[PDB]
Structure formats: C-alpha cells, structure tokens
C-alpha cells in the first residue's frame, strides 16, 4: 500500500513536463531568430538548426530522470 | 489503502499538459516569424514548416512518458 | 468507494487545461501575425489559416489523454 | 460520503478554468490585431471576427470534458 | 448532506470562476487598450471597439456556468 | 462540520482573489491607454472611464460566487 | 475543529493577497502612464491620481471578504 | 489543535507575501517612471515620490490582515 | 501538535520568500532606470539610490512578520 | 516527526523564492550595467554596486533559513 | 518505502525540472542574441556557443542533486 | 519513524530548482547584453563574463542549503 508509486509517477511527470517547458521557452526565441536569419540569407540553415536543437538537452535530461524513476517504479 | 492509480493519472496528465504548454510557447514565436517570412517571400514555407514542426518533439516525449505510465497500470 | 476516480479526474483536468493553455499561447502570436498578413496582402489567407490550425494538435493530444483516462475511469 | 465527488469537481474546475485562460491568452493578441485592422481598413471585419472566434475550440473541448465529468458524478 | 466533498466542490467552482475571470481579463486588457487607442484616433470606432471588448466575456460566463453546475452538485 | 466550512472559505477566497487579479490585469492596459488618451486630448475622459469600469463585472461575478458560498455556510 | 479555523485563515489570506496583487498589477501601468503625463503636462495631476486610486476597489472587496471570513472565524 | 495555529500562520504569511508582491509589481513601473522624470526635470521629485509611496497601502492592508490573524492565534 | 511548528515554518518562509520576490521585481525596473540615469549623468546617484532602496520596506515587513511567527515557535 | 520535514520545506521555499526575486532584479540591473559599461568603463564601480545591492534579499532569506535550521 | 520514497521522487523531479526551466529561460535570450551575432558576423561562433553553453551548469547542478537523492533513497 | 525524509527531499529540490530558475532569469538578459557587447567590441569579454557568472552565487547558496538538508537526511 501507500502513495509510493503514484508520487513516483507525479515526480516523473513533473520532471518531463518542466524540462519540456524549458526547452520550449528556449526554442521560441531561438527559432524566431533562426527564421529571421533564414529569411535574410538562406545560408544560415545549419547554424540555425544547431542553435535550435542545442537546448533539446534539457528534455533529454528530463527523459533520463524519467527513465530512472520508471525503472525504480 | 492506496491511491496509486489516480496519482499516476495525475502525473501522466501533468506530463502531457506541461509538454504541450512548452511546445505552444515555442510555436507561438516560431509561427509568428514563419507567417511573417511566408508573407514576405511566399517561398520560405519549407523552412518555416520545419521550424514549426520541430518543437513537437516535446509533446512526443510527453506522450511517450504518458503511454509508459498508462501501461504501468 | 475509493477516491481514486477523483484523482483520475484531476489528472484529466490538468492535462486538458494545460494543453488548451499551450494551444492558446501559440495561437495568440500566430493569429496576430496572420491578421497582420491578411491586412497587408489578403492573398495569404490559406497560409495564415494553416499556421493557426497547426497548433491544434496539442489540445488534440490532450483530448486523447483525457479519453484514455476516462476509459480507465 | 465520497471524496471522489469533490475531487472530480476540482478536476472539472481546473479544466474549465485553464481552458478559459488559454482562450483568453489567444484572444488578447488576436483581438488587438483585429481592432488594428478594423481601424485601418474598416472592411476587415469578416476575417478579423473569424480569427477572433476561431480559438474558442479550446474552451469548447474543456467544457465538453467538464460535462463528461459531471455526468460521471 | 456531504462532508469534505462539499468543500472540495466549493474549491473547484471557485477555481473555475477565478481562472475564467483571469482569462477574460487577460483578453480584455489588450483588446481594451487597442479599443481606447482607436477611440482616441477616430472617435467613430466606438461600436467595433465596444463589441470586440465585450466578446471575450463568454469565458467568464461559461466559468460561472460550470460553477453553477457544481453548486447544483453541492 | 468544520472541514467543509474551511474548504468553502478557501474556495471563495480563491474565487474573489483570482477575479480581482483578472480585473487588475485588464485595468492595467486599459488605464494606461486611457491616461494617454486623456493626456493627449482631455476629451476622451468619458470613454476612458467607460472602458475602465466595464471590466469590473469579473470582480462582481467572483464576489457573488463567494457570497453564494458564504450563504452555504 | 482547529482545521476549520486554519483553513478559514488560509482562505481569507489568499483573498486579500490576490486582491492586493491585482491592484498592484493595475497600478503599475496606470501609475507609469500617470507619472509620464504629470511630467509632460504638469496640470493633469488630478486625472492621473483618480485613475491610480480607482483600481483599489479590488483590494477593498478583498478586505470585505477577509473581514467576513474573520467574522466567521 | 496545532493545525489551527499552523494554518493561520500559513494564511498570514500568504497575505503579507502576496501583498508585498503586488506592491513590488506596482512600484517597479512607477519607480522607473519616477526615476526618468527626476532625471529629466529634477523638480518632479515630490510627485514621483508620492506616486511611488502611494501603492504601499496594499502591503499595509496585508500587514493589517496578518496582524489580525496573529492576534487571533 | 506534530504539524504545528512545521506549518508555522512554512508560513514564515513563504512570507519572506514572496516579499523578497516582490521587492526584487520592483528593484529590477527601478535599478535599470537608475543605471540608465547614472550613465547619462552621475549627479543622479543619491536620488537613484533612494529610489532603489525604498522598496526594501517590503522585505522588511516580510521579515518582521516572519520574526513574529518565529516568536510563536 | 513531520515537523522536521515541513520545516525543511519552508526553509527551501524561502531561500528559493528569495533567489528567484534577486535573479529577477539582477536580470535588468545587469543588462543595464553591461549596456552602460561601453562608455562607462570609468563608471564600472557604480554598475557593480547597483548589481550587488539586491543581494540583501538572499542575505535575509539565508538568515531565515539559518533560523529555521536552528529550530530544526 | 511508502510516502517518503514517493516524496523523494517528487522532490527529485521538481529539482531537475526547475533547473531545466531556468536554463531554458536563460538560453532563450542568449541563443537569440547569439544567432543575431552569427547572422551579422559568423566569426562569433566561439563566443556565442560559450555564452549559450554556460547556463547548462544549472541543469548540471540539478542532475547532481537528483543523483544525490537517488543514492540516498 | 520516517515520513519526513521525503518532505526534506521536497524542500531541498524546491530550493535548488528555484535558485536555478532565478539565476536563469538573471543570466538571460545579462548574457543577451554580453553577447551584444561582444559582437560590438570583442574586447569587453572580461566584463561580460564577470557579469554573466556573477549571479551564480544564488545557485551556490541553494546548493549549500541543499547540502545542509542532505546532511540532515
């Protein structure tokens, strides 16, 4: 018995959701700047992709913590 | 006693909701820049659509975690 | 006689509400840009409507998660 | 007495409130752009009203799921 | 004749009304700012500005509807 | 009972406070625009007062919800 | 019956605090515009003061609700 | 029991904290406008200080509510 | 009882934290305007420092309330 | 025994919110200072003082945290 | 095991999620400025990448705290 | 008897996460200004890096309090 598994799931969901929220907050302005640079030049595509996909490490670490919690679940 | 199942549902809902919130936060500015670019040039549709569809990975990861939690119980 | 169903409904409410919030956050800026493009040219209504209908996937996935949890109810 | 009744009420209230919040966040920016277009051209009323009334589907889905929860009450 | 469930119902309906009013106010802020700007500019945009201001009231209206349904379950 | 009484108090406090927050959010932008318009023209005073006093309906609704809850006490 | 009194206190504190927060949110932009207009014209002090003191009705109603809960307490 | 004192402490802390947050939100923009005005003209100091100190009534009301709660406990 | 002291600590910590958050929100814009004025002319130092240190009364009130609560402990 | 845990919760919440408020302050203050530095290399000290001034809120939060840990 | 284990998971998830959120908030503006600088010069790749990768220390400390909690539990 | 270890974990996670969030909020604007100054001059990197790494003391204090709580575990 007890609220063990449920609170573990709550923590897992909080980790994934807030990591994704931070990733989206970064990617908003980064993608806006990338779209502006692509409209200006159309040769900054690789740099824009690198800078946009770089903050995905936040949700990657969130998924790592999620998988750890799921394994201990 | 035990309330694990409903609390697991709470965690799953938090995960998908916050992932969707982060993706919406990104897509706001990204879509605004894309609409501006596609209004200016009418040919930046590929880059604009790629930059808009890229942040949906947050919702994809949130749905993955939600599916894992649902399959847990 | 357990209060598990109430927590399941709480998770449903969290998922749907946060997904709707994210979709609204995206659609705010996207609709502002679309209305500006319509006022400027009015020939890009198709793209303006497409880029606004695109963020509906967030609330669609929120509805899917709520349907899954309501089936679990 | 069952606490599940009150917790389902809490989840329903959360769903309705956050869906209304998302629709308000969208309609702020969209209505500002629409009022600007109206003051500019005086003939953009159809497109402005369509874009303003379109993001109400979020609160529509929220109220649908709230009524589903009230039926399960 | 309920116990803590009645209080939780009250909490839910209060949350619904409060967040619906918050969303309505968030919409009305920018919409009213644009409307007042248009009134100061032209003084003939009163009908359009007033209509656009009063349209987002449906959110708090439906939040009040849901709270009244919850008070029905109360 | 007393626990229901305290939770009803919490609910009515939340309703009144969040309605006040929403009206403050509206009145901030509306009052800024009205003060600017009056400082420019000094004849827009009535329209500014109307546009500032209109958002008070949300506070009125929250207060009446709180008074219904107090009547339940 | 201690939890009854405590939750009544929590509700009244939430009410007064969020009412004060809404009034502050309004008064921020209203006072900024008022100080700008006073520095510009030096004669519209009364209008700016009236518009600044007007949104305190929210904290007035919050205080009324708090005092009602105090009388219940 | 001790729940009354604990939750009344929580309530009064919420009251003072949110009142202080609202006053800070107001005083940010109000003080910025006042600093700009006194940097420009350096004779608007009295009105700038009056407008800056005016929104402290909200934290005064919060302190009033917290003092009432402290006297109650 | 076994929960009174902990909840008193929660209340006083929340009071101090939210008061600090509010005065920080004020000091952000106030200090930005102050540094902008100092860069224009260094003779504004006394008034800028007065305007910056004036919203410290918020955290002073929060600390006073927390000390009063700690006296109960 | 839950008093210890709730005391820890209150301590962490106090210092976290104080740090959040000081981050909010130092954001705009440091942005203005860095913008001012470009000509204000002479006036670097004023910008540094203006940035370091909001640390008093972390000082107060740490004082409250130390008091709560002493009660702990 | 039981309540303590689940609450440990909740705190772990809160730590990693909020650290990721803070890093995303920083990386938004930093990456936008970096992409602008790259579009201007393209010789600023080292400085832009360094300034973007410095906020990752927040997630590093959050993961450190999460691993500490995992080892403790 | 346990049951407080998880709460201490929650408090430690809250402290670390909110300190990280505050430092992210600071470093966003500070690093944006630093990248702008770097793209302007490429010589004030010392001042830019000092001002960027300076607010990290908040995370340092949060980590110290988290270490204190971990020792308390």
């Amino acid at each position: 018995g007890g609220l063990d598994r449920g609170l573990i799931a709550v923590g897992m969901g909080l980790a994934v959701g807030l990591a994704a929220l931070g990733t989206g907050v970064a990617q908003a302005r980064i993608g806006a700047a990338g779209v502006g640079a692509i409209a200006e030049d159309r040769s900054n595509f690789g740099t824009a992709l690198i800078f946009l996909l770089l903050p995905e490490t936040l949700v990657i670490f969130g998924l790592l913590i999620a998988f750890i919690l799921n394994g201990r679940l | 006693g035990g309330l694990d199942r409903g609390l697991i549902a709470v965690g799953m809902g938090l995960a998908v909701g916050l992932a969707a919130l982060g993706t919406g936060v990104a897509q706001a500015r990204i879509g605004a820049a894309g609409v501006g670019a596609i209004a200016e040039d009418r040919s930046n549709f590929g880059t604009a659509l790629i930059f808009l569809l890229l942040p949906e990975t947050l919702v994809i990861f949130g749905l993955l975690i939600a599916f894992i939690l649902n399959g847990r119980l | 006689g357990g209060l598990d169903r109430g927590l399941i409904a709480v998770g449903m409410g969290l998922a749907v509400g946060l997904a709707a919030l994210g979709t609204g956050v995206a659609q705010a800026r996207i609709g502002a840009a679309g209305v500006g493009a319509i006022a400027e040219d009015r020939s890009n209504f198709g793209t303006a409507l497409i880029f606004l209908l695109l963020p509906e996937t967030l609330v669609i996935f929120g509805l899917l998660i709520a349907f899954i949890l309501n089936g679990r109810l | 007495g069952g606490l599940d009744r009150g917790l389902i009420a809490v989840g329903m209230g959360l769903a309705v409130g956050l869906a209304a919040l998302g629709t308000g966040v969208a309609q702020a920016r969209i209505g500002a752009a629409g009022v600007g277009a109206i003051a500019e051209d005086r003939s953009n009323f159809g497109t402005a009203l369509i874009f303003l009334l379109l993001p109400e589907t979020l609160v529509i889905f929220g109220l649908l799921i709230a009524f589903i929860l009230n039926g399960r009450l | 004749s309920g116990g803590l469930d009645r209080g939780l119902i009250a909490v839910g309906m209060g949350l619904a009304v409060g967040l619906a009013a918050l969303g309505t106010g968030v919409a009305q802020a920018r919409i009213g700012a644009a409307g007042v700007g248009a009134i100061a500019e032209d003084r003939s945009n009163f009908g359009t500005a007033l209509i656009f201001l009063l349209l987002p009231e449906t959110l708090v209206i439906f939040g009040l509807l849901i709270a009244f349904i919850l008070n029905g379950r109360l | 009972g007393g626990l229901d009484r305290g939770l009803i108090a919490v609910g009515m406090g939340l309703a009144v406070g969040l309605a006040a927050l929403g009206t403050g959010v509206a009145q901030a932008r509306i009052g800024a625009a009205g003060v600017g318009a009056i400082a420019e023209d000094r004849s827009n005073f009535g329209t500014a007062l109307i546009f500032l006093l209109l958002p008070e309906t949300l506070v009125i609704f929250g207060l009446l919800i709180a008074f219904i809850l107090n009547g339940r006490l | 019956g201690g939890l009854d009194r405590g939750l009544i206190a929590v509700g009244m504190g939430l009410a007064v605090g969020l009412a004060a927060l809404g009034t502050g949110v309004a008064q921020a932009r209203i006072g900024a515009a008022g100080v700008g207009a006073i520095a510009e014209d030096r004669s519209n002090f009364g209008t700016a003061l009236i518009f600044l003191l007007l949104p305190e009705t929210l904290v007035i109603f919050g205080l009324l609700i708090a005092f009602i809960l105090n009388g219940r307490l | 029991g001790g729940l009354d004192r604990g939750l009344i402490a929580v309530g009064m802390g919420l009251a003072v904290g949110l009142a202080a947050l609202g006053t800070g939100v107001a005083q940010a923009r109000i003080g910025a406008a006042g600093v700009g005005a006194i940097a420009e003209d350096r004779s608007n100091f009295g009105t700038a200080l009056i407008f800056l100190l005016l929104p402290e009534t909200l934290v005064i009301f919060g302190l009033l509510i917290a003092f009432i709660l402290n006297g109650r406990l | 009882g076994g929960l009174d002291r902990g909840l008193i600590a929660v209340g006083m910590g929340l009071a101090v934290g939210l008061a600090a958050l509010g005065t920080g929100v004020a000091q952000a814009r106030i200090g930005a305007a102050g540094v902008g004025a100092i860069a224009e002319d260094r003779s504004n130092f006394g008034t800028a420092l007065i305007f910056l240190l004036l919203p410290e009364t918020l955290v002073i009130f929060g600390l006073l309330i927390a000390f009063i609560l700690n006296g109960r402990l | 025994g839950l008093d210890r845990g709730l005391i820890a919760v209150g301590m962490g919440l106090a210092v976290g919110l104080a740090a959040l408020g000081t981050g909010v302050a130092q954001a705009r203050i440091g942005a203005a200072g860095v913008g001012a530095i470009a000509e204000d290399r002479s006036n670097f000290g004023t910008a540094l003082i203006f940035l370091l001034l909001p640390e008093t809120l972390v000082i107060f939060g740490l004082l409250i945290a130390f008091i709560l840990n002493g009660r702990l | 095991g039981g309540l303590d284990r689940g609450l440990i998971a909740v705190g772990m998830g809160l730590a990693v999620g909020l650290a990721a959120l803070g890093t995303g908030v920083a990386q938004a503006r930093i990456g936008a400025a970096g992409v602008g600088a790259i579009a201007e010069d393209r010789s600023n790749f080292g400085t832009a990448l360094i300034f973007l990768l410095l906020p990752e220390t927040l997630v590093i400390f959050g993961l450190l705290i999460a691993f500490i909690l995992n080892g403790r539990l | 008897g346990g049951l407080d270890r998880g709460l201490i974990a929650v408090g430690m996670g809250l402290a670390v996460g909110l300190a990280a969030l505050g430092t992210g909020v600071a470093q966003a604007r500070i690093g944006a200004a630093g990248v702008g100054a770097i793209a302007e001059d490429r010589s004030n990197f010392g001042t830019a890096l000092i001002f960027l790494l300076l607010p990290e003391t908040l995370v340092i204090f949060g980590l110290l309090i988290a270490f204190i709580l971990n020792g308390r575990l």
């Binding site: - | - | 509906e56 | - | 009231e57 439906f62 009244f68 | - | - | - | - | - | - | -």
Partner: protein, 313 residues
C-alpha cells in the same frame, strides 16, 4: 422588402454587408429569435419596466424628432433609426416580460419581506414554473432548451445552405450542408447516448447513418476543410449555453442584491425598509448599467456569428 414587423430588424441585418443577390433574406429570423432568448436571459420584469421607461423617453424623442445627439459616443439618429430602435425595444421587452413570468422572481428575491410569488413550499401564493435558483431540474431543463435552440438554428442554417446550393447550382455547398447536417445529427445522437441511457443500439444506427452521410460529403468536398469545420459547428451548437449562463448570472445578481437589501432592512432596522430599498435600487442600477450591454450583445452575437457565417455573408 419585408413586412412592417420585420422592418426595424433590417437595421441589425444591414449593419453588416449586403446579401450577395439571389440569396434568401435572413431578416425575419431576427424578430423570431433575438427577443425570445433575450427575454430568456433577462427574465427580470422590474428591469423590463426600466427598459419600457427608457423606450417611453425615446418615443418622446421621436415626438421631439429633432436629432438625439450623444457626443459621448458621437451618435446621430434623427427619425428612422430611433423609431426602429423603439420598435425593437418594445418587441423585445414584451418577450422579456413573457419569459419573466416563467422567471417569476421579480426584481430579485423580493419574496423575503412580502412574498408575492411562491416557492413550491407555499402553494397558496402564485406558482413559479421554473424555480430559478433551484438547480436539480432547472439547470438541466434550461441547458436542454439552449441546446434545442442551437440544434434548431443549425438545422435551419444547413438546410438553407443546401437549398441555396440547389438553386444556384452550387452543389459543393449543397453537399457540405447535407454532410454537416448528417454529421451533427450523428454527433448529437452520440452525445445523447453518452449522457446515460439504455437502448443505445437504435441510436448507434442513427449515428452510423449520419457518419456515412458525412463521409460521402467528405468524398465530395475532400479538400482539407471539412472535419475542422464540423468540429467548429459542434462547438457552435455548444455555444448556445450562453443564453442560460447569462440568465443565471442575472438572477444571482438580482437575488443577492435583494438579499443584501433585506439584510439591511428586516434583520437590523425593521423600519429602514425605504433606506434598504434605496441602497438595493442604487446597486441594481449600477449592475444594470454594467451588465445590460453584454446581456443584449450575446443573443445578437450568437445570431451574427452562428447563423450568418453558415448561411452566407
């Protein structure tokens, strides 16, 4: 060209764009529908008497036909707009009183001091058909009434679109109208089944037939527009709950204002009845001024968006 009963609502119709010719005139729909659910929303016979007094002042202006100038809104309506507004206001206040009869609580909960109308605990007084503040029957009944009005408008609009497509050889719009009607019938059947009822096998066949009709219409007009539009039409069906929600809000405002007035008069003074009535009237006037604009906007908003965007315009 309209009958003289529908002539003032020509103002409301022609405030927007003119019809695209060869199209039916939606003008007589407004006198049929708008005052009906306006009265359903208000139901406050005292507020209706206030509206009648305002209409009498406007008729005095009609006798004083020289223009009414309001520099606050810059409005000039010398004979015709003011005559049409007087006609609309009288036609509307009639149904306001008629629905106030069912809404029998008069000027708020005035039954506390001297009960004219009667709750079911008091059969000796005149009965009230719908208990207003009770929620067990009234909420479901009025929600279903609003849903029924929405369904009636949806069927009328889609049938009109189909008939216009038949007459104008606009067969794509005819197929769209038929498919939308069938799909929304299926959605309504699904909603009725999910509300909780047995014999769902018969509703299953109706839902399947509606979905098949909608699928045929998608196969005709398949180009990316159909199913989001039908979702918005389902939302438009759901949007008619406003006419109950706003009415409940108005009833609660009036009832709690009368409760405050009787708390001032009966419970504390026992002789300050006039003072309590004055305070209640001041609060009623403030509430009336703040809420009347939205209460009159929402029905015409429902018409202007829901019926007119489907029908044409």
């Amino acid at each position: 060209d309209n009958p003289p009963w529908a002539k003032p609502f020509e103002l409301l119709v022609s405030f927007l764009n003119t019809p695209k010719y060869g199209t039916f005139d939606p003008t007589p729909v407004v006198p049929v529908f708008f005052p009906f659910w306006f009265g359903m929303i208000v139901g406050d016979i005292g507020y209706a008497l206030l509206f009648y007094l305002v209409g009498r002042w406007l008729s005095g202006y009609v006798k004083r036909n020289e223009p009414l100038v309001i520099d606050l809104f810059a409005l000039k309506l010398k004979p015709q707009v003011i005559g049409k507004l007087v006609h609309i206001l009288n036609w509307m206040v009639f149904w306001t009183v008629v629905w106030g009869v069912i809404y029998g609580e008069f000027f708020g909960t005035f039954l506390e001091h001297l009960g004219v109308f009667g709750t079911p605990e008091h059969p000796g007084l005149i009965p009230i058909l719908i208990h207003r503040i009770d929620t067990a029957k009234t909420a479901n009944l009025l929600i279903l009434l609003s849903v029924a009005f929405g369904v009636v408008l949806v069927f009328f609009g889609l049938a009109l679109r189909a008939y216009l497509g038949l007459k104008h050889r606009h067969m794509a719009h005819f197929w769209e109208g038929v498919g939308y009607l069938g799909g929304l019938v299926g959605v309504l059947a699904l909603a009725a089944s999910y509300l909780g009822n047995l014999q769902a096998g018969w509703l299953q066949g109706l839902m399947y037939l509606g979905f098949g009709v909608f699928l045929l219409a998608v196969l005709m007009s398949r180009i990316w527009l159909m199913i989001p539009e039908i979702f918005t039409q389902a939302g438009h069906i759901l949007s008619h709950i406003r006419i109950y929600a706003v009415g409940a809000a108005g009833g609660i405002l009036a009832g709690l204002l009368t409760d405050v007035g009787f708390a001032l008069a009966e419970r504390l003074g026992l002789l300050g009845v006039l003072l309590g009535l004055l305070v209640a009237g001041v609060l009623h006037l403030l509430i009336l001024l703040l809420t009347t604009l939205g209460h009159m906007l929402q029905p015409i908003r429902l018409l202007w968006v829901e019926f007119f965007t489907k029908f044409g315009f």
